Symmetry: C4
Amino acid sequence: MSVLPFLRIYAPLNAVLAAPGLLAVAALTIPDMSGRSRLALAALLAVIWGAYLLQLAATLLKRRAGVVRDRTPKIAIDVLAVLVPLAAFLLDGSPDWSLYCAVWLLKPLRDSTFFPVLGRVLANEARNLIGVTTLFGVVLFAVALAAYVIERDIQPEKFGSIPQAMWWAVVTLSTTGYGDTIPQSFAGRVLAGAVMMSGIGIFGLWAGILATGFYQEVRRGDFVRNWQLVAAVPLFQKLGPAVLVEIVRALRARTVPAGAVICRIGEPGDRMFFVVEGSVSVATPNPVELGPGAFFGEMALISGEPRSATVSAATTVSLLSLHSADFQMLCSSSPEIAEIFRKTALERRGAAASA
Amino acid sequence: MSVLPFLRIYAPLNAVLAAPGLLAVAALTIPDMSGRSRLALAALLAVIWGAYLLQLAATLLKRRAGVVRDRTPKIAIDVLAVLVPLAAFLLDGSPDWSLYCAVWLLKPLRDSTFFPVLGRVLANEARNLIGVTTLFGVVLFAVALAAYVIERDIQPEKFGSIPQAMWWAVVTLSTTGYGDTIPQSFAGRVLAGAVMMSGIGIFGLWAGILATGFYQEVRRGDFVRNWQLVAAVPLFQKLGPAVLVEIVRALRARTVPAGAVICRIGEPGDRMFFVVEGSVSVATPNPVELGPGAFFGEMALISGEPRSATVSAATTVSLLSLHSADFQMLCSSSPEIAEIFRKTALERRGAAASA
Amino acid sequence: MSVLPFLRIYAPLNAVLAAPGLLAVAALTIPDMSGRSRLALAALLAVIWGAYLLQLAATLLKRRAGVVRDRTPKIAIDVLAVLVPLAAFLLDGSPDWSLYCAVWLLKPLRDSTFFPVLGRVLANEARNLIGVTTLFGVVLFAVALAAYVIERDIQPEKFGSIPQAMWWAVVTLSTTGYGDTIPQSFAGRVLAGAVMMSGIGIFGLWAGILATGFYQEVRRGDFVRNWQLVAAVPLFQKLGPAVLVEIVRALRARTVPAGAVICRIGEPGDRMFFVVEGSVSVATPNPVELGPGAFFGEMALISGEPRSATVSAATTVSLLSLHSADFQMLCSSSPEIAEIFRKTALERRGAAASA
Amino acid sequence: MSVLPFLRIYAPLNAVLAAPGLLAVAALTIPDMSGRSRLALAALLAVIWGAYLLQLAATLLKRRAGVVRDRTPKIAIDVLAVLVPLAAFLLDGSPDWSLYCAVWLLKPLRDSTFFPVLGRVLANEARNLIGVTTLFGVVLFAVALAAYVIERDIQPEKFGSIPQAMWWAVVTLSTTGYGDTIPQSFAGRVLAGAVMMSGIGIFGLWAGILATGFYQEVRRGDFVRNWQLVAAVPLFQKLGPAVLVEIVRALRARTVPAGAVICRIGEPGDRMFFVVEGSVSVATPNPVELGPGAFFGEMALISGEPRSATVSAATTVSLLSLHSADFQMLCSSSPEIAEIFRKTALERRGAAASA
Ligand SMILES: [K+]
Ligand SMILES: [K+]
């Protein structure tokens, strides 16, 4: 609720081309299809082939920033990005070579930041997941077995065996309900009374494990990525030790591109920002073009008013942001700091129109 | 658990008429329907047309409060509220003109406060949502493809192509289970063992993103809307800086209308309120009719007793509220404040019956 | 994880008889049923009728504790508990009179504590629920309408109207997937790609509203019910103001009945209790039978050892409880208190075997 | 996100053999199966029989550590692990004796730590669960009954009775949607509008009860298991009382086996560890092989750099771990401690290459 995320977070065309690239697949998969576009999409594969392949060698030119690096991840796919289609192109002469479009699916995961963020926490909490997965296997066959007890007599063709009932177990337990094979008697139907009761309680825990400290990591990602942009601020030499831990939980940093708007004049003053690198367009008669290490919004928060200037991104700015309460928290935290932001709420009034 | 929300939060008739207005649609959609009520409901459309249209120009009279305003939102629908039926009324001579009842659906969203509250946070956390949405697309075709590997031979008419299996993917992954096309072999049925395991883990995170800091915003909405009603209180000049951040998290403000009851006599004393504007009916022999900037309940909390008066809303009061613990927190927070609320628990005993 | 809940929390037989009472219904609902037990269960209704009716007048004897009471709730059903069967017994001469077994269903809700706990919070947060319910209605017909656009031509009998598609909306949106009427074309099937995405995000919020501050109330129920049992403790005159708010969050109170076990000897010392009313059986050669206002477990926690005595409930005791950390929190909180619990860890060593 | 869990948490072969042991069952359950492997898997049962039975007496040799123990749990299955197949082997001469493979399903639960962790909290919060379970039974028949009101006339064979509709209740309420028996009229279809609305709100609470303080217990498990490894540290005599409660919430302890890697050189310095028992391989020209009661990572955190050494597990080490923020919290918490970790960031620079 407090951030301006811009400049194409889904930026790199390495990621962009997997989506249209794999939709080329399906038309080959269909009978009675004209040969015209049949191969026209195979070009686009060759384009994406040639495109990453064009990009490939530039990546294999890893004499850029060549001091110490760990690029086993970023290279693990680019290699196979072109090899696997190639060997597929010859050995699998039939159209089945296209079935090696299971390969580009990692290219999103190549430059998927937020995917290592996922895999990080699984290596702390899987202790639970296994004991739950076991426990899921307990409840699975603990309950799947009681069905064969009953309808094997009058439903051989559906429940004349165990795994046919273990099939109906997870369908019955995992919220799904296909609707192929269902009991007819009473007591077998009684048993379902505890199943959905169970599995919704189980996954009530099990999937809960994921979001549990995943949020800790994302709420932690907002700190580790933002213990940076701390020393950059000229004013933050007085901040006590325990002060920052209270604060950086809320502070997120994002980048705005050049030409974009930052805060439009007259809209309700609801937030203030800290500039640390870039330049702005504080839209005034004399534009107060503030550079790395600046801020604005106290004019609108101490007064609780609309904006005093159509601030727009003159350049690509690495932005911070902050809503009132946590700044009211700061204004409540120390009288030493409100002195400057009092003067600032008088300097910027005259300094906005003037120079 | 601690608030008296009253006076028709779903107040404006601009919102009320969308619901019955769109139920006029369906009777036109049905064969063998008598022409009698067929057009009778078209009137009610013309009523809602004429009604907002009657309301319309009063809104286009925006010389009220005309200093600085941002009403691109509130006007964006009122314009089309009447135009779109109108052009639809003539060009689409057949009854299909009624199909432009997709238009009023924004009129709730016109005066839907809590809808901008939604859209505010999506512009901070969609970074995650995309990486998850990509990741959802990863897992989609990563898993959808393995089905065509198998049953294309003996299920052409169901799994003789890829998207027919991507169809069975999300139905299998997104908790649904329609039950149209399901495997027959073993290993294809083995694969589902991880799917519901996956998607319930995925949406365990993904929908978790929404409620994650959505609650922060709603728990924040309870502050930004209630840093107001702070200076109004005559007693709150002594409150230290860090005191309020502890408190305003819990304090919610709502309005009660005239004639309503506030706290009924003899019910268990469970809460105390702060009046800031309006008037009450403290039901006593001499009604102690307290106005803007008053409170009551300490009589019932310091003693832990039922109510001392059938307080009812003499007028429309902008109410605050507070349960014991957070006031016990206040009574624990400072001895300076319990002095007055000790006297108040003696003044109001005699002042209730007397003047 | 830290409490001994015993003495039949589902105690009153007023609640017990609704369950078997309503299972008497179904046998009447079935053809080809013998008249033998057909009316035998009607007796059990007459029993439950006569039983509450026997209990009834004792409740209508409300000259017990007749000072100030609010028993509109507890009486609202007992009245109709016997009247509604009675008027049903005569006017509805056919067996349909049994269909007034929709009446006892409130008798659980009569003496359902935890049900007012539910209804308390709905009167603070329904503001959200309506805006979401509206928003649910937005997304409902916003999406339901686009289906009639498509398959009305080739599916009249299923999608030849709007509400037939609004039917398929919530089934498609609310996680269910019956499997009666599903599209055949492409773009109509494309639309489902966002639906489960939506509704699982919606209910990801909407049902989240319930548990959101419901837990606040239950975590609050653990305080309001336990600001009692505070002054009872002879030692708690020194506890500072802000000390208790830290503590009572964790402290739960429950009752154990006479004859039950409290802590068995040799089991791992994992918790300590505060007796406030009742008596125990500290199983020793000289049983140190401690009465109202006592405690035990510091012997096992300061040493981190198994139990020093098979403490069992000599009588019905109103119990408190506490795990180590929060007592380690107390031992960390003040050196003034560990002095006594040091002596206590020496007195009770000799006082256990001796008197 | 901050722990190295290794050395086969799913270690004991007592647990390993239940999974393959029960998959021996199904082949017997199937007609037209050759007798060759039919009994070959019965051997593997006899193996698992003989295997635990071989393990059995070693467990019944409970003169190891025979001082005070509570092994009613660990023995409750081992006894029946071999007896139940045995009596089954003779009395049930037909192949049905295999149906006593419902017995090993507890053997995972025998040595399932994290299963008592489950059962611990159910004995505090089931108060809620019953009132919800009752309330679930309220809503069940409250809603199930209204269906028989309607379609009994034109759907006898599906809704000609009550429990046939209570069947359609939970299927309709518990998120499932089999798709066997669905209404045809309007008002009966209207009723579903509140059902999924309800049950998703109910289980929104009910399953929420599980994860609610289950996480408290797991977040508590991280303390009770880690108030140990406190006195072992030679430096922690100065830590104030309230300091540790802040810290041990995050600190998890796990064990790494011999031969494994701990932190690889050049990877981004993201965490520091506390050795308390074992030995390491700090890969340097002179390996600084640190033993019980050591730490490392401050070199990479105070500088925010990659690793200074390929530390690998020379032996099985009982590890602790800690990310920066909580150590930055420590560095912010006291200047007394950064003095040593300043010297340590100079000693270990020279002491790494040297001795
Ligand atoms: K379903
Ligand atoms: K289905």
